[PDB]
Enzyme design. Structure first.
Site, mmCIF file in Angstrom:
data_model
loop_
_atom_site.group_PDB
_atom_site.id
_atom_site.type_symbol
_atom_site.label_atom_id
_atom_site.label_comp_id
_atom_site.label_asym_id
_atom_site.label_seq_id
_atom_site.Cartn_x
_atom_site.Cartn_y
_atom_site.Cartn_z
ATOM 1 N N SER C 140 0.827 -1.196 0.000
ATOM 2 C CA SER C 140 0.000 0.000 0.000
ATOM 3 C C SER C 140 0.866 1.253 0.000
ATOM 4 C CB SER C 140 -0.929 0.007 1.214
ATOM 5 O OG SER C 140 -0.224 0.349 2.394
ATOM 6 N N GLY C 144 2.560 3.680 6.390
ATOM 7 C CA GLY C 144 3.982 3.943 6.554
ATOM 8 C C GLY C 144 4.818 2.679 6.537
ATOM 9 N N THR C 145 4.413 1.678 7.323
ATOM 10 C CA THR C 145 5.170 0.431 7.371
ATOM 11 C C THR C 145 5.193 -0.241 6.009
ATOM 12 O OG1 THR C 145 5.362 -1.705 8.489
ATOM 13 C CG2 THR C 145 3.144 -0.869 8.075
ATOM 14 N N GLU C 254 6.636 -11.475 -21.011
ATOM 15 C CA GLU C 254 6.105 -10.736 -22.156
ATOM 16 C C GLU C 254 5.012 -9.751 -21.743
ATOM 17 O OE1 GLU C 254 5.019 -13.342 -25.296
ATOM 18 O OE2 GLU C 254 6.885 -14.498 -25.223
HETATM 19 N N1 LIG Z 1 -8.407 -2.563 -1.199
HETATM 20 C C1 LIG Z 1 -8.193 -2.505 0.111
HETATM 21 N N2 LIG Z 1 -7.459 -1.468 0.641
HETATM 22 C C2 LIG Z 1 -7.238 -1.408 1.972
HETATM 23 C C3 LIG Z 1 -7.747 -2.382 2.809
HETATM 24 N N3 LIG Z 1 -7.384 -2.086 4.072
HETATM 25 C C4 LIG Z 1 -6.659 -0.950 4.054
HETATM 26 N N4 LIG Z 1 -6.564 -0.515 2.762
HETATM 27 C C5 LIG Z 1 -5.852 0.687 2.317
HETATM 28 O O1 LIG Z 1 -4.649 0.817 3.045
HETATM 29 C C6 LIG Z 1 -4.465 2.147 3.465
HETATM 30 C C7 LIG Z 1 -3.760 2.176 4.812
HETATM 31 O O2 LIG Z 1 -2.715 1.230 4.831
HETATM 32 P P1 LIG Z 1 -3.024 -0.285 5.273
HETATM 33 O O3 LIG Z 1 -2.815 -1.236 4.119
HETATM 34 O O4 LIG Z 1 -4.439 -0.367 5.794
HETATM 35 O O5 LIG Z 1 -2.005 -0.592 6.480
HETATM 36 P P2 LIG Z 1 -0.565 -1.258 6.232
HETATM 37 O O6 LIG Z 1 -0.372 -1.679 4.796
HETATM 38 O O7 LIG Z 1 -0.390 -2.410 7.186
HETATM 39 O O8 LIG Z 1 0.441 -0.085 6.643
HETATM 40 P P3 LIG Z 1 0.261 0.524 8.110
HETATM 41 O O9 LIG Z 1 -1.113 1.136 8.182
HETATM 42 O O10 LIG Z 1 1.323 1.564 8.365
HETATM 43 O O11 LIG Z 1 0.357 -0.589 9.122
HETATM 44 C C8 LIG Z 1 -5.852 2.750 3.554
HETATM 45 O O12 LIG Z 1 -5.844 4.073 3.078
HETATM 46 C C9 LIG Z 1 -6.707 1.891 2.653
HETATM 47 O O13 LIG Z 1 -7.033 2.590 1.478
HETATM 48 C C10 LIG Z 1 -8.477 -3.425 2.285
HETATM 49 O O14 LIG Z 1 -8.932 -4.287 3.028
HETATM 50 N N5 LIG Z 1 -8.704 -3.484 0.932
HETATM 51 N N1 LIG Z 2 -2.545 -18.030 -38.416
HETATM 52 C C1 LIG Z 2 -1.959 -18.401 -37.254
HETATM 53 N N2 LIG Z 2 -1.036 -17.576 -36.705
HETATM 54 C C2 LIG Z 2 -0.421 -17.899 -35.549
HETATM 55 C C3 LIG Z 2 -0.769 -19.159 -34.890
HETATM 56 N N3 LIG Z 2 -0.024 -19.233 -33.776
HETATM 57 C C4 LIG Z 2 0.736 -18.113 -33.721
HETATM 58 N N4 LIG Z 2 0.501 -17.321 -34.782
HETATM 59 C C5 LIG Z 2 1.145 -16.015 -35.054
HETATM 60 O O1 LIG Z 2 2.201 -15.790 -34.127
HETATM 61 C C6 LIG Z 2 2.202 -14.427 -33.714
HETATM 62 C C7 LIG Z 2 2.588 -14.381 -32.250
HETATM 63 O O2 LIG Z 2 3.895 -14.935 -32.205
HETATM 64 P P1 LIG Z 2 4.560 -15.470 -30.850
HETATM 65 O O3 LIG Z 2 3.729 -16.570 -30.241
HETATM 66 O O4 LIG Z 2 4.784 -14.350 -29.867
HETATM 67 O O5 LIG Z 2 5.952 -16.047 -31.397
HETATM 68 P P2 LIG Z 2 7.119 -16.402 -30.360
HETATM 69 O O6 LIG Z 2 7.369 -15.193 -29.490
HETATM 70 O O7 LIG Z 2 8.375 -16.759 -31.117
HETATM 71 O O8 LIG Z 2 6.683 -17.565 -29.504
HETATM 72 C C8 LIG Z 2 0.819 -13.869 -33.984
HETATM 73 O O9 LIG Z 2 0.936 -12.626 -34.676
HETATM 74 C C9 LIG Z 2 0.143 -14.886 -34.875
HETATM 75 O O10 LIG Z 2 -0.152 -14.295 -36.142
HETATM 76 C C10 LIG Z 2 -1.784 -20.001 -35.551
HETATM 77 O O11 LIG Z 2 -2.132 -21.088 -35.050
HETATM 78 N N5 LIG Z 2 -2.317 -19.567 -36.692
HETATM 79 MG MG LIG Z 3 -1.199 -1.063 8.337
#
Ligand SMILES: Nc1nc2c(ncn2[C@@H]2O[C@H](COP(=O)(O)OP(=O)(O)OP(=O)(O)O)[C@@H](O)[C@H]2O)c(=O)[nH]1
Ligand SMILES: Nc1nc2c(ncn2[C@@H]2O[C@H](COP(=O)(O)OP(=O)(O)O)[C@@H](O)[C@H]2O)c(=O)[nH]1
Ligand SMILES: [Mg+2]
Ligand SMILES: Nc1nc2c(ncn2[C@@H]2O[C@H](COP(=O)(O)OP(=O)(O)O)[C@@H](O)[C@H]2O)c(=O)[nH]1
Lengths: 430, 49, 439, 32, 48, 430
Positions: C140, C144-145, C254
């Site tokens: 987060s 702080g921690t 990638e």
């Molecule tokens: N998405 C999500 N955010 C949270 C949650 N709990 C706390 N937060 C966010 O965390 C911020 C405060 O930090 P926390 O994560 O709660 O606490 P911490 O990471 O242990 O750090 P310290 O508070 O210093 O101990 C708040 O502003 C919240 O937005 C949660 O359950 N879900």
């Molecule tokens: N027509 C066709 N193209 C394929 C197929 N598999 C992969 N490609 C082509 O491969 C490209 C992606 O290449 P990529 O998988 O990243 O190659 P690599 O990085 O060497 O593994 C895409 O643009 C596709 O056009 C297939 O089964 N059919």
């Molecule tokens: Mg905390």
């Protein structure tokens, strides 16, 4: 008739053999207890290559298990296929080496080697005509490397005409198992190159590259890993035990892989190794066999093979396959990729065929090549060693058992010179 | 046909290898959670006391 | 191998994360207790929860989330509620003393001793992730921690994890509806601090949401819970593209490359539709043209601003349900032809289209009614300048004679921190004027 | 079910697998 | 017959060439079928 | 003999290829399990063109699928007709370029393309004698287009003598789908022109127009578009794989549809396309085929073809039909519309005939033509690009990853020169 014996030491060495006998044991169909149940005679024609005979028909594998601690060797006993080993052939100490080469080659190793050497002189003379010795060990271990580098030195003293062999695993700089890996690694290599005629390296770290990618099994285990190395075992000695188009014993390969006496490091490979899930789609064909056979990702070693060139290559195929297709396919490898094949030596790949294939498949190939790329194995090894010597770190452990600081220096210089001399031919041109 | 004979047999043993371990781990995993139920209650039981 | 991690701060953040999590859980099919329902027996499967859950190996599934607040009541209530067995017990780091809405307090007094734990936890959870896409932040402005913690988190994340995309769902105060008497100061400070680190942010001002809720659902006594429900549905619509099958996909990555014309202007506002309660939803046909038209309609824009008051320059929308490209282009042509909604000169097309199939899951006991088609849009329009225009005035009036300045100065902030923020806002104020002028 | 978007709905409708070459066959031999 | 010939009747075998893929050239995913199929079970948790 | 390989990029490319492979499998009679279930012998004579041989006879399409995002691939592997693809060839990334051409062509693609190139090389060499390539890609997507274009130059730098195509779908402003389509399409075309041998652009807007006005189906679908595209593709290469009156491989159309080196864009259309009720009141007759084929609305390019003149036009009338009739109808159509056929190149239409028709139709024809009317899309794209660039809209993204504004300045000039040179010949007279 031209049989060989196994001499292994170290838990890493023991395990390689322990799985080694299992894979071979099935090749001629020897049951776990030694009861014969083979089907084809050819499985029994050349059994002398690895086994002796005794009353009751149960066969013995002529092995000599050696280690300075009881834990590892006591392990293979209770598992399957460990019962085969003759109890009298076990020699073991009670102290332990602590990964300290000094404790493993000078003080403790020497005291026990007397008895173990005795058994070595015992079984070998028994055979009609010894062919050679194959030894598996670990360069990164304390108890293993010491005796492993030592027993070989004395063995070469009594049998100068015998063919020598050693399969090794070296510590890669990436995943290190031993904090003292640089020491026991570089220190050993000085002695190994002194007497051993041949030497191979398999990189554990490269092995995992074999599993996590090729076999596609999520949980490789030391049970699984050993299997690959075991297959390469039969890759070299294969044709020596079966009929074939062009027999190629151990010594013949030496005559065609080593340009000079001081380059005896090779890297091996096995194919086809395909995951369980994909096995149906591929089609077994020798050409497909070769491409994966020369594939950069199939070599078990850490050296990148595209950073140098091959001095010589070896091929040992399996199965009833056309003679020509090997020839026609083998040549093209030396033309389409001329940049990687040296230019001052022609037609630099040899081939061979064995008509009886490894169990379960229809074609197989074993890879062996002396490649200049292996330089990067030691330079990395040397770099760590030099970085770890300047401040005399970890110097007291070794120097406290009679070894002086002078010995390390000689070891480094020999390693450094080999590095340069290896690449002299790489830039050499005709 | 026989070319399939050896391959099928070899894969059979290996799969039994895959089954032996998995069945081993699965039982242990039964142990792994088994204890925890036995220990939480003891703490639960002591609470009332 | 796709996943995202949600970083939340502020009581609002927690209470919105609650609802978004019930939505997502009911959407994938996991009961609150964390054990897969023995009857369903999903068995061997992947995806689904991975994009938002991590496999424990066996049994439960830990929601890949972290909750951070400086206030204890919300954390305690969440822990003791009916979702207790879901989250990790120790990942809900909760402080002791309230920051008390003092942004300055939330940035230099009681935030530095706990941001370390926050970052350690985030790192640990990330390292296990192997396909990190980005982040989501809900915080987060008027607290702080929340503002202080969010500012610290964004500033550190800009230096820890590189160019990894990040999205920020801030919340700003409504033009007239307010909750505090000191919101503007923290609002301005947060705007300044967050300007140069958050890539994308969408407005969610409360008063507009109140307006939509009153207008459509026909329910006269809303509460914060319904707003939270709508927001959670908004997040679900935005993110559904990454975990359900579809004929045309777009990812979180990638978005930051297709709705930000300039590196500076990166504020856009979104909207949702349709929003029809079950009491009357079915009387209309359940007109894709009318639904698309409503998508652009001024009233439902979730942020309190008048689209007619500004130009359009970027409009990204996602479709889900039984949508089809036929309807998509039939509607797009009409929207484009429209005159009352015009497009900026230098934006010949500002449409990025994604097609998805899974319909929006309808939760029981709520206001959302069952539907078959939905349209959710994220748009960056020239109208955005209005919110900042109103905030500036709310600030200078107060600052005229140093109102409440005593407590903020006494919390360690230097005297001049406010003037720099005002200057930054003015520079932003100048930009919107510059970009929006035709050649 | 999602079948209504999956497959196409195009319809385009036996002893039509003879080449144009198969027009050459059989034709038995027939002073002062 | 040990090179390249030009007639559809007699084929020309392939001549393989080395690649340039490093020992760690990324790539992964697609673990649908695997040797182990990592173990997963369902054990009810207590009520605490 | 003269086989081809498939490499699709982007989600559009993956879907289009998924439909095309289903069509091909149906036309050759291969079930999802991969076991031959055909009727006549001819269905297997040249099956090697698109498929590969494996143990047990289950045929596997030789397609390579690439994407930086996984969802589309993991979806396509589970749908109908998805089990034919080799899992080995699936090589892909994880992060993606996010519809950013720079991201997809420089930062990520640079790292990812190594394995894809290795596998594509493997397959292409494995084939007997590569005839060419086919790449279908969507210009409008950044992550796709980047790698799709990069691979074009990568392959063209190693296979100079081979022929390659480019099936492209361009985004029209009316049918806009991406906000960065101007940028990505312009940048892509800049590179496509310089290296692509052939390009066939199709418009989604025109596709939709045809689907609604002609087919009269209540609701089109992506499958509906894909099926038309796949039918066109099948027509594009029908005669290369069946007995026929007058074989015309890719090279023949390449020579007969390119006046100058820099014009490699055509437009295509498939006929007949009739309403389910119109499939029986209609007469499948030779004159009707040509009439519907030259009718403007059937073209998949949104530009009205009549706004200019054609340079070259060739047709592949598929199935057994007349020859006197094809020749006479071509003459009649070329005369009756004299002004619409450029004057300085007499005999400005090509005729091709093949016997095997589609499964379900007796007469069908695929139309390929290069006409001046295509300038409309390029002009519109240029105008859209200018309207944005002149204000520096969305500019910083493509500049923050290494691409400088100099490249953007260069590309526009080249596009403008291409447009000018394409329009000039419209006014050329003899
Ligand atoms: N998405 C999500 N955010 C949270 C949650 N709990 C706390 N937060 C966010 O965390 C911020 C405060 O930090 P926390 O994560 O709660 O606490 P911490 O990471 O242990 O750090 P310290 O508070 O210093 O101990 C708040 O502003 C919240 O937005 C949660 O359950 N879900
Ligand atoms: N027509 C066709 N193209 C394929 C197929 N598999 C992969 N490609 C082509 O491969 C490209 C992606 O290449 P990529 O998988 O990243 O190659 P690599 O990085 O060497 O593994 C895409 O643009 C596709 O056009 C297939 O089964 N059919
Ligand atoms: Mg905390
Ligand atoms: N592949 C494989 N490597 C092993 C195995 N056991 C040991 N090693 C290797 O051996 C190294 C340790 O050697 P170590 O046992 O200390 O030799 P030691 O001196 O004879 O005891 C480690 O770096 C391991 O990589 C095994 O079962 N398989």
């Amino acid at each position: 008739m031209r049989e060989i014996v196994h001499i292994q030491g170290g838990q890493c060495g023991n395990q390689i053999g322990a799985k080694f006998w299992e894979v071979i044991s099935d090749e001629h169909g020897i049951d776990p207890t030694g009861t014969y149940h083979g089907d084809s005679d050819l499985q029994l024609e050349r059994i002398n290559v690895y086994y002796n005979e005794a009353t009751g028909g149960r066969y013995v594998p002529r092995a000599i298990l050696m280690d300075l601690e009881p834990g590892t060797m006591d392990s293979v006993r209770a598992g399957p296929f460990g019962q085969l080993f003759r109890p009298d052939n076990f020699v073991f100490g009670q102290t332990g080496a602590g990964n300290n080469w000094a404790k493993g080659h000078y003080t403790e190793g020497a005291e026990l080697i007397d008895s173990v050497l005795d058994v070595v002189r015992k079984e070998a003379e028994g055979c009609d005509c010894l062919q050679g010795f194959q030894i598996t060990h670990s360069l990164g271990g304390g108890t293993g490397s010491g005796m492993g580098t030592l027993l070989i030195s004395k063995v070469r003293e009594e049998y100068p005409d015998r063919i020598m062999e050693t399969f090794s695993v070296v510590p890669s700089p990436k995943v290190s198992d031993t904090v003292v890996e640089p020491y026991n690694a570089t220190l050993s290599v000085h002695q190994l190159v002194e007497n051993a005629d041949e030497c191979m390296v398999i990189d554990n770290e490269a092995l995992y590259d074999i599993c996590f990618r090729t076999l596609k099994l999520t949980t490789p285990t030391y049970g699984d890993l050993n299997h690959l190395v075991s297959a390469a075992m039969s890759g070299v000695t294969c044709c020596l035990r079966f009929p074939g188009q062009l027999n190629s014993d151990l010594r013949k390969l030496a005559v065609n892989l080593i340009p000079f006496p001081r380059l005896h490091f090779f890297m091996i490979g096995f194919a086809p190794l395909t995951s369980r899930g994909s096995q149906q789609y591929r089609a077994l064909t020798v050409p497909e066999l070769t491409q994966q056979m020369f594939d950069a990702k199939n070599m078990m070693c850490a050296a990148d093979p595209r950073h140098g060139r091959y001095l010589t290559a070896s091929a040992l195929f399996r199965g009833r396959m056309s003679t020509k297709e090997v020839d026609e396919q083998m040549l093209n490898v030396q033309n389409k990729n001329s940049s990687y094949f040296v230019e001052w030596i022609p037609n630099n790949i040899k081939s061979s065929i064995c008509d009886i294939p490894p169990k379960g498949l229809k074609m197989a190939v074993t890879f062996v090549g002396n490649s200049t790329a292996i330089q990067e194995m030691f330079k990395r090894v040397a770099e760590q060693f030099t970085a770890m010597f300047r401040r005399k770190a970890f110097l007291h452990w070794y120097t406290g058992e009679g070894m002086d600081e002078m010995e390390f220096t000689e070891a480094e210089s020999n390693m450094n010179d080999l590095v340069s001399e290896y690449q002299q031919y790489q830039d050499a041109t005709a | 046909r026989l070319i399939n004979e050896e391959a099928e047999k070899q894969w059979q043993r290996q799969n039994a290898i895959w089954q032996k371990e998995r069945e081993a781990k699965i039982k242990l995993m039964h142990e792994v959670y088994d204890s925890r139920k036995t220990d939480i209650e003891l703490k639960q039981t002591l609470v009332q006391v | 191998m796709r996943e995202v991690i949600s970083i939340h701060v502020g009581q609002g953040g927690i209470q919105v994360g609650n609802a978004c999590w019930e939505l997502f859980c009911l959407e994938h099919g996991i009961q609150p207790d964390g054990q897969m329902p023995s009857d369903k027996t999903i068995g061997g499967g992947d995806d689904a929860f991975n994009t938002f859950f991590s496999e424990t190996g066996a049994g439960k599934h830990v929601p890949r989330a972290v909750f951070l607040d400086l206030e204890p009541t919300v954390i305690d209530e969440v822990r003791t509620g009916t979702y207790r067995q879901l989250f990790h017990p120790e990942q809900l780091i909760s402080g002791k003393e309230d920051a008390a809405n003092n942004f300055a307090r939330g940035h230099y007094t009681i935030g530095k001793e706990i941001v370390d734990l926050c970052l350690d936890r985030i790192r640990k959870l990330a390292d296990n992730c192997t396909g990190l896409q980005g982040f989501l932040v809900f915080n987060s402005v008027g607290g702080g921690t929340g503002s202080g913690l969010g500012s610290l988190l964004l500033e550190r994340l800009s230096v820890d994890y590189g160019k990894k995309s990040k999205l920020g769902f801030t919340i700003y105060p409504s033009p007239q509806v307010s909750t505090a008497v000191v919101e503007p100061y923290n609002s301005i400070l947060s705007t300044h601090s967050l300007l140069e680190h958050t890539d994308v942010a969408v407005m969610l001002d409360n008063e507009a949401i109140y307006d939509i809720c009153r207008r459509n659902l026909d329910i006269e006594r809303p509460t914060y819970t319904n707003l939270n429900r709508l927001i959670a549905q908004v997040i679900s619509s935005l993110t559904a593209s990454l975990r359900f099958d579809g004929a045309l996909n777009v990812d979180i990555t990638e978005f930051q490359t297709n709705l930000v014309p300039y590196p500076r202007i990166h504020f856009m506002l979104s909207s949702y539709a349709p929003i029809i309660s079950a009491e009357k939803a079915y009387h209309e046909q359940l007109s894709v043209a009318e639904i698309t038209n409503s998508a652009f309609e001024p009233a439902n824009m979730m942020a309190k601003c008048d689209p007619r008051h500004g130009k359009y320059m970027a409009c990204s929308m996602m479709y889900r349900g039984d949508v089809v490209p036929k309807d998509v282009n039939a509607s797009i042509a009409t929207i484009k032809t429209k005159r009352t909604i015009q497009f900026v000169d230098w934006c010949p097309t500002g449409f990025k289209v994604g097609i998805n199939y899974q319909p929006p899951t309808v939760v029981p006991g709520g206001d959302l009614a069952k539907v078959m088609r939905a349209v959710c849009m994220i748009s960056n329009s020239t109208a955005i300048a209005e919110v900042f225009s109103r905030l500036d005035h709310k600030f200078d009036l107060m600052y005229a004679k140093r109102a409440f300045v005593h407590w903020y100065v006494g919390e360690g902030m230097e005297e001049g921190e406010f003037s720099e923020a005002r200057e930054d806002l003015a520079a932003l104020e100048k930009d919107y004027e510059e970009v929006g002028i035709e050649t | 079910d999602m079948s209504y978007l999956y497959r196409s709905h195009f319809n385009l409708e036996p002893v039509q697998h003879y080449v144009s070459n198969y027009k050459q066959n059989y034709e038995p031999k027939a002073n002062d | 017959a040990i090179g390249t010939q030009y007639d559809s009747r007699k084929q020309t075998l392939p001549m393989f060439s080395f690649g340039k893929s490093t020992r760690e050239s990324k790539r992964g995913t697609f673990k649908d079928m695997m040797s182990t199929q990592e173990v997963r079970i369902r054990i009810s948790m207590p009520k605490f």
